[PDB]
């Protein structure tokens, strides 16, 4: 219960600081060709030719049967593809006409806007079952807001703001209806329906709030600031978006780690950031959380968790492969004064020139215009300290000069997208996974539910973890690490994973400890059991070529890297091959991967193992 935003202002404060009549819009006016030329630089011709290809574009009708197919077969794409084509056409024409200024694209902007007003709804087939009727087809009697409608509303606000004049010159009723549609589909429902899930009014501890709150709220807020010229209404609206987002900010951990991972960062942290930027601009700088430490951490997560050459930390049901918008990262980095994020944005560019964001997000498209020339000058670099410690999420990133990166975690087995992975580590060598976390497959008939933990990628059996008395971890809030510490100077991460195992495992403490020195990684296991029932087993997931030159030695050759894993001779090593039938896994790792299995005869109520990994 930080309630940051509410502390920064109440409703009456807010009435003073708001900027009315859209004097806050940072783009030059439409008819100011000189200012736009400057801002566009070299995007100008690129943007015009993109818009030239759309001079003859047929705006697409979305048939009732496309929406109805969601009920019939779960096919969302049949509705989503033409919708998205229409939005992107609309966004592209906007940029192209801001680029040229001659009115060559006004007809198609008008055509797009008028067709959009004629649609019953901007909500997606998939999200429409939240209406009273629960159906996948729009009910002209009701409007809700999802991710689609929000963005569709903000794109339309922006079209309306920018081309109100040439549109009224042609016919004043287009802009009139645009104001009607945005009022009816965004503004009126936003103020009148307390019960949309993503708003998190009538959230209770334990319910989830996720990226929808900052995403939806950011487009709502755009819509108010562009379209609502009554100051008392705007004040009440913005204060409502503040109370809403405050629930997202309170839900998130203060250390800034995204427990979902980097793939959702763009639209989580990144939408939170967008919201705050929009809020700031709209209050002439007066309600700005952009210098909040937590927000900055949330932005540098993306830097810290990006290992290299496409590989990312992938705790839980996330992909080992990952990316990022350089332009969003740059912009975010500027706003919270992270020289780190700014250099990292340049790094992701990887020698390519930054150009305008296209796609279907007006705010991101327009903003990317302003940051574009600075980013082309920034020096490409991925500097970050040797240790990153997220103490609430319980993630530790440690890296040495010789190209090893370890990600270890504590945590609990009820994380979002949870894997039973408490205490697990992943080792990258020069960015290449060597001891890996398999990650996400395509969502079968069990993914969500019990029977989730009968799938192998979700079991502790298939993470870099011991099986205690031959027993794996269990799922649930109760099943977690204790006394997780991180010594930032000695590069030592250490945690008791005992409570992450069920009663049968019969363990008091099991302390799993990671030490990174400059040359090598020492893994220790230190355990005291309530009864020695079965032998412990230890596992490591890997790929490439694996060999066993001698007892207590394994060698892994993967993607140019080559490593030695030294293991107690008390164990007998075997390799298991894991055919990858699921394309969502074989996309990443290829055809198969491997689990190294360490098994023993020894059974002791107390013991320790020392494992050592280095290059050769
Ligand atoms: Zn995993």
Numbering used by the authors: 28 to 643
Give passages from the manuscript.
Crystal structures of BtPL33HA and BcPL33HA reveal a two-domain structure. The two domains oppose each other in such a way that a deep, open-ended cleft is formed resembling an active site that would be compatible with an endo-processive mode of action of BtPL33HA and BcPL33HA. Analysis of the five enzymes via SEC-coupled light scattering and SAXS indicated that the three PL33_1 enzymes BtPL33HA, BcPL33HA, and BsPL33Heparosan are dimeric, while the PL33_2 enzymes ObPL33CS and ObPL33Gellan are monomeric. For all five of the analyzed enzymes, AF2-generated models display a closed tunnel-like topography housing the +2 and +1 subsites. This differs significantly from the wide-open cleft observed in the crystal structures of both BtPL33HA and BcPL33HA.
In bacteria, however, a different strategy employing a class of enzyme known as polysaccharide lyases (PL) is deployed. PLs selectively target glycans composed of uronic acids with a C4 hydroxyl group linked to the preceding sugar in the glycan chain. This enables PLs to operate through a β-elimination mechanism that relies on proton abstraction from the C5 carbon of the uronic acid sugar ring, resulting in double bond formation between C4 and C5 and elimination of the preceding sugar. The three characterized PL33_1 enzymes were all from Bacteroides species inhabiting the human colon: BT4410 (BtPL33HA) and BcellWH2_04512 (BcPL33HA) are hyaluronidases from Bacteroides thetaiotaomicron VPI-5482 (B. theta) and Bacteroides cellulosilyticus WH2 (B. cell), respectively, while HMPREF1181_01744 (BsPL33Heparosan) is a heparosanase from Bacteroides stercoris CC31F (B. stercoris).
